[PDB]
Amino acid sequence: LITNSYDIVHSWFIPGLGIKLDCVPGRSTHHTFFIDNVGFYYGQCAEICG
Amino acid sequence: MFFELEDIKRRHSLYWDIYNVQGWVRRPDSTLYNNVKRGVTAGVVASLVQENITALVENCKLLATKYEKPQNLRQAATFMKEVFKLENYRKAVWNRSQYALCIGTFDIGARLATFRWLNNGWQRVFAGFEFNFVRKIPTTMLAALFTAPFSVPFELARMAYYGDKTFPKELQRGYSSYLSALARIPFEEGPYFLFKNSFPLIIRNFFQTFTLFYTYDFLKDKASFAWRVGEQNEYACKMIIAGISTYLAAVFSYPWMVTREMVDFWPKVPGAPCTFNGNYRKAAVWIWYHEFSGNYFAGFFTKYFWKASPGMFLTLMLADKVGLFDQTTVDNFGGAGNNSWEDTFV
Amino acid sequence: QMFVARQVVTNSKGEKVEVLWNAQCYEDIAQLNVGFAPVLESVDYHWEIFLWA
Amino acid sequence: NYFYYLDRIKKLFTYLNDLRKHILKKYVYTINHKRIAINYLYFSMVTGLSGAALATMIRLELAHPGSPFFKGDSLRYLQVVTAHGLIMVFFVVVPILFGGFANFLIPYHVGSKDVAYPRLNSIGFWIQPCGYILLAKIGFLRPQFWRYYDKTSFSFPFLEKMKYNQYKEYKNDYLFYLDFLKKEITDDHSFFWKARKVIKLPQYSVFSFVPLKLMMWKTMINYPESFWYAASRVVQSRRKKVFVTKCSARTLTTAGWTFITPFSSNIKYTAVGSQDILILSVVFAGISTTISFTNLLITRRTLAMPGLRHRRVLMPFVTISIFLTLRMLATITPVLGAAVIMMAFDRHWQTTFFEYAYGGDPILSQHLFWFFGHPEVYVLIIPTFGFINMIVPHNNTRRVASKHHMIWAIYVMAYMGYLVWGHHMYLVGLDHRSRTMYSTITIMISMPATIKVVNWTLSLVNGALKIDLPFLFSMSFLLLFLVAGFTGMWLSHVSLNVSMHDTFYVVAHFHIMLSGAAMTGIFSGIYYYFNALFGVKYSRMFGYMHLIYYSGGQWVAFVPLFYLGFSGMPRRIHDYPVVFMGWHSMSTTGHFITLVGIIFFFLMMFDSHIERRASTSTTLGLPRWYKRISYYIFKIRYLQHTKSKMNGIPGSTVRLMLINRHFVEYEVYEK
Amino acid sequence: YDWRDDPKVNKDIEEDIRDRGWHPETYDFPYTKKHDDWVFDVTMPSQNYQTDLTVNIHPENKKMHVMKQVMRQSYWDAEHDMAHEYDYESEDLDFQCESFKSQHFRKKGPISQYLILGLLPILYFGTEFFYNHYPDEDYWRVAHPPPLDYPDTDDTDDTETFKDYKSFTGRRMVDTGIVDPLWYDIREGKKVYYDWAGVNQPMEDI
Amino acid sequence: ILKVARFRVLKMRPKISTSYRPHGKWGDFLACIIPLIWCINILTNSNLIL
Numbered sequence A: 001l002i003t004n005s006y007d008i009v010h011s012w013f014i015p016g017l018g019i020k021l022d023c024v025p026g027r028s029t030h031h032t033f034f035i036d037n038v039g040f041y042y043g044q045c046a047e048i049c050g
Numbered sequence B: 001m002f003f004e005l006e007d008i009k010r011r012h013s014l015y016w017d018i019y020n021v022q023g024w025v026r027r028p029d030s031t032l033y034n035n036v037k038r039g040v041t042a043g044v045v046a047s048l049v050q051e052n053i054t055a056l057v058e059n060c061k062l063l064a065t066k067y068e069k070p071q072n073l074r075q076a077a078t079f080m081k082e083v084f085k086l087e088n089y090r091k092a093v094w095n096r097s098q099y100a101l102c103i104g105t106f107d108i109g110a111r112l113a114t115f116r117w118l119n120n121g122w123q124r125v126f127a128g129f130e131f132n133f134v135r136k137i138p139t140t141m142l143a144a145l146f147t148a149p150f151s152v153p154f155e156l157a158r159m160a161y162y163g164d165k166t167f168p169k170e171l172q173r174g175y176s177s178y179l180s181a182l183a184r185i186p187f188e189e190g191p192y193f194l195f196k197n198s199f200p201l202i203i204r205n206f207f208q209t210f211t212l213f214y215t216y217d218f219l220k221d222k223a224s225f226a227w228r229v230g231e232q233n234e235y236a237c238k239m240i241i242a243g244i245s246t247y248l249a250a251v252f253s254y255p256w257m258v259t260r261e262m263v264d265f266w267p268k269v270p271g272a273p274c275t276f277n278g279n280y281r282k283a284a285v286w287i288w289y290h291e292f293s294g295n296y297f298a299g300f301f302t303k304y305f306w307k308a309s310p311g312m313f314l315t316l317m318l319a320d321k322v323g324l325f326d327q328t329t330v331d332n333f334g335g336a337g338n339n340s341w342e343d344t345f346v
Numbered sequence C: 001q002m003f004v005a006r007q008v009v010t011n012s013k014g015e016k017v018e019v020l021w022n023a024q025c026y027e028d029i030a031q032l033n034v035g036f037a038p039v040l041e042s043v044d045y046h047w048e049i050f051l052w053a
Numbered sequence D: 001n002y003f004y005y006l007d008r009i010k011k012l013f014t015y016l017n018d019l020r021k022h023i024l025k026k027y028v029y030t031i032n033h034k035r036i037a038i039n040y041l042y043f044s045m046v047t048g049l050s051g052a053a054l055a056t057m058i059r060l061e062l063a064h065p066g067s068p069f070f071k072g073d074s075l076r077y078l079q080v081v082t083a084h085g086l087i088m089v090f091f092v093v094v095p096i097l098f099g100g101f102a103n104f105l106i107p108y109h110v111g112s113k114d115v116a117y118p119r120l121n122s123i124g125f126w127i128q129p130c131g132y133i134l135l136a137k138i139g140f141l142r143p144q145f146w147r148y149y150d151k152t153s154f155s156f157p158f159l160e161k162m163k164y165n166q167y168k169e170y171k172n173d174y175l176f177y178l179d180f181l182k183k184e185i186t187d188d189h190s191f192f193w194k195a196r197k198v199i200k201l202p203q204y205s206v207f208s209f210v211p212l213k214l215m216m217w218k219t220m221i222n223y224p225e226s227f228w229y230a231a232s233r234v235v236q237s238r239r240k241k242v243f244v245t246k247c248s249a250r251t252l253t254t255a256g257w258t259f260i261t262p263f264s265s266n267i268k269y270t271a272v273g274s275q276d277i278l279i280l281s282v283v284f285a286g287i288s289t290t291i292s293f294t295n296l297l298i299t300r301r302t303l304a305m306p307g308l309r310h311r312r313v314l315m316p317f318v319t320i321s322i323f324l325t326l327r328m329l330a331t332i333t334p335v336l337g338a339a340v341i342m343m344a345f346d347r348h349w350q351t352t353f354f355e356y357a358y359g360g361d362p363i364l365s366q367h368l369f370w371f372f373g374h375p376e377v378y379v380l381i382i383p384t385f386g387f388i389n390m391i392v393p394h395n396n397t398r399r400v401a402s403k404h405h406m407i408w409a410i411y412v413m414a415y416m417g418y419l420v421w422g423h424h425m426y427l428v429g430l431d432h433r434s435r436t437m438y439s440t441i442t443i444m445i446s447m448p449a450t451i452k453v454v455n456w457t458l459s460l461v462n463g464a465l466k467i468d469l470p471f472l473f474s475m476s477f478l479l480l481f482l483v484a485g486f487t488g489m490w491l492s493h494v495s496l497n498v499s500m501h502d503t504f505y506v507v508a509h510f511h512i513m514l515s516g517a518a519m520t521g522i523f524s525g526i527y528y529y530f531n532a533l534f535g536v537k538y539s540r541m542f543g544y545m546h547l548i549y550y551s552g553g554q555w556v557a558f559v560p561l562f563y564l565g566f567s568g569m570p571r572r573i574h575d576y577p578v579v580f581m582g583w584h585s586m587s588t589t590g591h592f593i594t595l596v597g598i599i600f601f602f603l604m605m606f607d608s609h610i611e612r613r614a615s616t617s618t619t620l621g622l623p624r625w626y627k628r629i630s631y632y633i634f635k636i637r638y639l640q641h642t643k644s645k646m647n648g649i650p651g652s653t654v655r656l657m658l659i660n661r662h663f664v665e666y667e668v669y670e671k
Numbered sequence E: 001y002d003w004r005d006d007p008k009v010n011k012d013i014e015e016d017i018r019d020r021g022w023h024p025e026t027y028d029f030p031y032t033k034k035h036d037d038w039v040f041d042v043t044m045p046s047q048n049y050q051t052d053l054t055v056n057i058h059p060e061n062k063k064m065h066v067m068k069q070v071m072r073q074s075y076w077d078a079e080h081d082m083a084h085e086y087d088y089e090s091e092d093l094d095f096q097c098e099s100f101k102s103q104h105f106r107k108k109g110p111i112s113q114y115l116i117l118g119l120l121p122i123l124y125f126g127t128e129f130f131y132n133h134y135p136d137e138d139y140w141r142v143a144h145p146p147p148l149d150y151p152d153t154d155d156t157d158d159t160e161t162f163k164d165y166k167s168f169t170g171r172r173m174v175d176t177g178i179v180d181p182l183w184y185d186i187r188e189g190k191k192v193y194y195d196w197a198g199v200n201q202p203m204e205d206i
Numbered sequence F: 001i002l003k004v005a006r007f008r009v010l011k012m013r014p015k016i017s018t019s020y021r022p023h024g025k026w027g028d029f030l031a032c033i034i035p036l037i038w039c040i041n042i043l044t045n046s047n048l049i050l
Ligand SMILES: CCCCCCCCCCCCCCCCCC(=O)OC[C@H](COP(=O)([O-])OCC(O)COP(=O)([O-])OC[C@@H](COC(=O)CCCCCCCCCCCCCCCCC)OC(=O)CCCCCCCCCCCCCCCCC)OC(=O)CCCCCCCCCCCCCCCCC
Pocket: B141, B142, B143, B145, B146, B147, B148, B149, B152, B191, B192, B195, B196, B197, B198, B199, B200, B202, B203, B206, B279, B280, B281, B282
């Protein structure tokens, strides 16, 4: 997963998987994503954005 | 127009909010007839048990002062049987039963009716715990103050009735019963004879009713997580909450009643002015500012606890059963919950 | 609150002298009761702890 | 005399004028440290109430989903949250400790007539109000002050100047002015409002929609006010829907108390307004701090009594903790100032310090802020440990356990907190090498905290305990600290921190620390120095009520927040999934319980002054029983004092008989 | 001398029992009066009975004495204190005199202002919310549902909802139980909520 | 907790604390075993997930 932001810093958060990725503008952070089960997960952004 | 002050009536325009719930809405059952009926019913039943217990305990003490207390179960059984057949016990039960009817109908009923009137409309939060309980504090305080002095005329009439029985025949009024004494005292000694120096009773009643109704209402909702999430026994939790409520009511009420002992019963120093000038209010202030709590907490159980607490505990259980502490809870995202349904699912 | 005890002791020169035991505080002059009366109550309140600097 | 009544009035005027001069000289123009500290405490109460009010707004909004309080104003909620954080941190705890306690206590604990800079001490106090107002009222104040139902179209056309721009050219070039006047008049010196309501009246070919209040110029001409009354709440139409926007400009918000860039440092997202005021106010607060620790630190170094110049051990623990924190503030204040100044330049001058496009480093802003950020919270807490370390030995009649080790325990935390600022930036994307270093040092910080906990516990054993309200607050402080620190140690768990970052678990963690521990310590000191501050003994009754309700509220308010954090609720969100209704209602309930505790505290102070009774030291002049002779002296006087206090109540025999034969209500007599 | 200020002569002065034996006007500033000393004959006899075999001490038989109230804090004297603090500007040398009486002592004064201090949380919160009407003028008002089809149908939609419930689809949905029963009835030009809806009736349009 | 609340009050059994100053030299090291184990457990569990 390559996380990035268009305008400001956001957070790609999935509490079910326990994954929190900060999408920072101007960066191409690479993360490892491995879901070891069949499931459907929801999420909400976890960084003040506006 | 009618007198110096004018009650100006004004009209206003429409206003509405997003949410129509969790505020103040008067329940349909909150009416003068219904609230008074329920309050009187709960008070009378609680008072009857309270006075019967008080009569039984005092008769047992009276019998024990002349005979050895029970040594085993068999001696206890015969002791109770003898107490029941005592001539004094039967008369005490009859007179105190009348006292219960008057107190439960004019004092406990008034407290419950006023509390329901001022606190029926406080809705609770759906799928949650009622917050902003501070809003209910003024209502309970208003009810407690309003109904505080409704018991003093009866209590003084009770004391006058019993105190008359111990005088010689020449100096004895000769009251037929408590009701006769209550109906005669106003015309003999005057209405103020039933209210003079009533501060100890008034403050006692206020601190009893306020901390009993409010604490039970607060605890019965805030502690509901025990049986709402923990799957605990709801009735057992309510009984425990009622037990806590009555115990606090006794603790906060007894110290103000101790002023009677300090002012009148404590021996007076020869030649020196009275420590409290015969004023109960000043004695209560002294108790309030006294450093050692145990000094004025002595005799809490032997003197006051069992004469008041059993009555208060029953009143809460009876009031809860009839529905004096039941509030209305509705979903805030339901049809009537809010006026904006476009964001209840989106 | 001024002195908590007193004693009379004969020093090596043969003269009897009076020794007084001052009241003390736990490292906190603020808690110390600065008073000039044989009274436990803290009656005197001083705006200037060091009047003469 | 024929004017005896007038003469009495003349005396009253003289008395009032003299009192006015006395009050100004003694409470406004004074430089006395004790008076300044007392004024600091009263200011703290006002700011504390303001912070409490902001907290209440947050809880009411978070009570249940759907924005019951702000009704969709996400921007307004964010401003209120930022105001709550900044006010509580820089204008509640800091004034109480470094403003009231430090000014009141440092002269006592160092032996100085006054601070080294009495002028600066007075200056520091009188500068606080402006910063407090700026950071506290941002929730109320917006650049777009008007509400959504204000018809700004009735006032903006008057403000427009391009309408008369055609006349500007001829005001300087008269050559063709006459030709210009010969044109056709269409809208010169006139306003026409297009129809706002559909009207079908064939009788009239034109309709008037001028504002009603602007109908007649005979009254407008002499009225010295802007034409806003016309547009201010003149229409009954309203829409009570959450999805209806209340602020047209979506950028009129705040980036929290952390100032995250580029959101905080770019007008495209956080437009001009509250954000800029916070930036300058933070720099303003930093300079106020610069005056504060400069005066106090030099006071210790230059005016400390002989024998205490360098022996930090001898001084009371609160003074030791205060001085250490002041040194921390000096080290970290410049870093915050530089970061905040750079934010101001980027917003206005567009220096692109935090713009990645041309070399900016958005993460640099977080580094500089958190470099000061973490030492700040350590600065807030370290002074709190002092209260328990002084109160417990005082009431226990025993020396504190390992005072030297506790001093070094706090010191190691002080100068090792400068290398853990990055645990607030684990997920930002920094290198793993730095990430591991921050985690490793952060967990090691737990050890010195454990040292203090064991020392606190050991100070309660094998002593003469004198239970008092300050002692009870100390026990409540200890109980809250144990959970507070333990939760923080879990946050050091890197894998758990990934899920718990920017969730309510962190919110729960530092509320138990700040709201729980720091405030309990502050209240513990207030009752410990109540006689020294107010000159009268406190009322134990309302004091007990304040302790029980305040302590209870903090637990009920913030313990459920841990459950929300585990559930996965993010932070700074005013509308949340329905599944969080249960615990948020508990959290709101706890806050109201805490507020009830605050009510008792103010009633306690009011009741105490009503009592207005001289206070008596509990030690009776024997703080320590180092020898059996001292113990006997205390026992002899203590028993004598107890007899005098008991001299006015009946003996045991009289009391028992009165209690036994109290009942006098019987039916039959004659035996 | 004035008998109006003498409690013994003037019976209108309400004596404070809690301040018996304490006269703030008689304090010294600095206080240099001794009011406590060894007290005996209360429970411990002053005489000697250590070896008296025929005498046994019974502390339970304690005679009651005069109540000893806790010392009252000093009360300020406005005229005296103001003169004491008063210093002549360009006529007084800037110095501290040797006498310790010049120390500025704190004396408690009027207690009325502390009532506002006790009620400050109530006053402050009331000002913050009620006086400033924050966050709006409708949050703290008693809630009233909108009138029928007010302000517009797109927002209220009472008539369409009423028809939907009364339609075939509405009855089926209520049968499923997912949709709760209708909570209002459209009377002759007015909307009336059922008593079980738990909401006040809509305010009159005037 | 039980001992302090039952006997250490002035009423029951106060103790004459004659100790002037502390003399601990390595109690901190001994006590820090427990938090040390906490750090080891946190590091071990955290790293295994990482
Ligand atoms: C609803 C309001 C809700 C507000 C909620 C607010 C919440 C927040 C704040 C809460 C705290 C508030 C505290 C207030 C200040 C209290 C100060 C204080 O302690 O000292 C006062 C006073 C101290 O007097 P004192 O000089 O020290 O004398 C000491 C003696 O021991 C005792 O004194 P005494 O023996 O010399 O006098 C006893 C008093 C006894 O008075 C009573 O029992 C009446 C109740 C009020 C008594 C309050 C004291 C008197 C105040 C002045 C006059 C009051 C008039 C009546 C009330 C309205 C005006 C306030 O006697 C009289 O004053 C005259 C009695 C006349 C004979 C009886 C006739 C009764 C009327 C019958 C006809 C009309 C009704 C039936 C027919 C209707 C038509 C069909 O103490 C009290 O009387 C009790 C105080 C207890 C304080 C605890 C809280 C309870 C307060 C209850 C009072 C109100 C009862 C309900 C009536 C009002 C609402 C309807």
